[PDB]
Amino acid sequence: MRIQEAIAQDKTISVIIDPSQIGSTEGKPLLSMKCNLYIHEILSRWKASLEAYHPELFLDTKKALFPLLLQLRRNQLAPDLLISLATVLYHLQQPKEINLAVQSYMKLSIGNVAWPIGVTANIMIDERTRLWITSIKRLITFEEWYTSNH
Template identity: 30%
Template sequence: MDQTKKYLKRSEVEAQRQADYLREQDELEKARVERLEKKRKRDEDEGDRTAAREAKKKRLAKESRKAAEEEAQTEENARRKRIGLPELERKADGDEGTPLKDGEEDVADDALRDKLKELDEPRVLFGESHIQRLRRYYKLTAKALAPTMTKGPIPTILQLVDEKDMKVPEALPEAAEAKSFVRRQIASYFDMVLSEWQFALSRRPTDVKESFSGKQAYHSFLQARDNLTPLVRKLETNTLPEVLLTAINDIVHLMQTKCYVKANDAYLRLSIGKAAWPIGVTMVGIHERSARERLHETEKADGQAHILADETTRKMLQGIKRCLSFAQTRWPPEDLGQLMG
């Protein structure tokens, strides 16, 4: 700036102020970068020192453990020599003393390498011993034989059938193999219903999805999926009671034939049974009435209310009911009289 001027314009003063401000900011930025660089270097040095200390600690611990093992082995050999027993062989470095698991047999190394080659796996890994190679082979074969999970709404190890083979029989068969196939059919059918339900929800417009009713519909789907998960698990492990399997088979058969009213009746028979439900006062006199006998029919097999058996069964049947309600909208019947109200 010209020092001979007696007066300065306001623009010149502002320009000088901005120049001073920018110069000050540059100096501050340089100082900040320099501090960060010093801090990074200190952290790196501290990390290197920490790694060196840890490595030294591990090395000393390994040497101490090795020295203790050698001393113990020397003492044991001296003791065995005094009593006339042969000395123990020294264990080579990297030798594993862990025996194989039950059912695992040792395999010759050449044959083991050929087996690994047949599995398209490396025959030898760097630094791998025979025992490690054998364990790797058994681990690979166990993984190959392990059942695979499906990718549906409810993942399962059951082998699901195609849609053309999902039609369950009208009556539950007696043969064990046929029952096993029926369990696969039931799991496949509910997997298909849930998949169609999920796909229908995903096709809705965004404003419908974000509305209150849209969120409620999605919550109903999630609840039905969670409620049906125990059913699929029981079908996997063949732990579903015979009476429940028979009733669910009837419901699925009626759903597949689009007889939704009859399917709902079968659901009601399964859930609340055929027993009379007392309302109000049940004992109004000292004499036994004939109609009162029906109040105790829940103790019989045909009148048992399975929905009250336990919480898991109640939720499971509720999930079946939700799938029944969706199925009649996805696959409407030709006879409108079969639509539930």
Template identity: 30%
Template sequence: MDFASILSSEISKKRKQVASASSPTDGTEPAPKKYLKRSEIEAQRQAEYAAKQQELETQRAERAARKRAEEDEAKRRREEAKELQKRLAEERREREAAASGTKTVVEEKTEEEGMTEEEAIAKLREMGYPARLFGESVQGRVKRCKRLMEKREEKQLMEAPAVTLTEEEMKVDAEDVKKDPELVYRQMDAWFRLVLNEWRKALDERPLAVKESFQGQKAADAMAQAEEYMKPLFRHFKQRDLSKNVFEKVCEIVVEAQKRRYVRANDVYLKLSIGNAAWPIGVTMVGIHERSAREKLHENQKEGGAHIMSDEVTRKFLQSIKRCLSFCQTRWPPEDPLQLMG
């Protein structure tokens, strides 16, 4: 036997051993290849890419389905809120119409809109209040029941879910102030709630060191105070009973603020807020002669009635509107730097 035959036999034995090792018969997985072809690497990459794209497509479909469900739910809530507000407004109009007639003292003592003592006691027990108080007369019991019922209805009106509007739907059109005041009331209610929510988020996102500083606590207190002072304004929005002068000026402020013209919005605020109360402390309007300024400030007083700032509630929510304007110019800065109020 020569050397070539011995070498070929050894090579065949080695090939058989390698083949048996690469394809085991005990069911275990074959050992991974030490070297891969470029075509095999490309095939693996394409398979991984296809799997990843399939996973992303599934996630996109799930997000789209969730978004559609949320939009449907929001639409349903808006419809329910509109129906509830419409029903509450109708009840309020009926109640005002019933109370518009003149009542004599005898009618107040005996009628109280037809409520008897038994009905008043039943209503008081239903609302969780004592049916009788010490020394309380029948007339006082009926009046107390009516007063508590009005408070409960007002609370239900305030707790009614606000109509959800998009930012485009919140934009107030100056022509709608007289054409469709109901729409303008809803738009202003939604816009001021949006501003307060954005203000609250901006304060919550501050670093802890800023929150705990004196200035940080002062800013948080100012926001909480503005939110508390604006509750009567939101009540006016829901009841649609804001006075005509204040309603038109607040609409003008909102229109200018939404267009990011904060200087003009501040000018409207000054025209609305400065009145007779400004003269005892020596305040004059800038750029206007003193006599002309006095005449302009007294123009709104010819129709009679006190100035709006003599009302403490109105003064507070107007000052809160001014604070909202200051926040808006930082949250939605104007394109023109001259529109900053300073």
């Protein structure tokens, strides 16, 4: 079968992440794609805010994120690595949980699995993974700014 390709074209999937699905082995393909869609959505809003938020950093962040985005679209991320990323993104989607997103990010940052906080150990981090982790931090700061300015 070619389920992953069906998922990538499925227009009934939104960017909204349900925390209860984080960790589910069966819901992994779907969650992987949702993270891909939301990251694209965050970049879309930054692009709409270029005039007001670090325009000189956009293009580079976007480009550094392409490999991760492709991995998410193809569901090639490791279980615990997806769990940690989805956790960061989930909290980032929640009102007033910017500190929970940062806390989760720091866990992912030092090779530790991150699970959602208040709702519902080790992970391998190579040069490839380290690259997008660093970039994800820029999305976090953009969202913090976007929220405070709206």
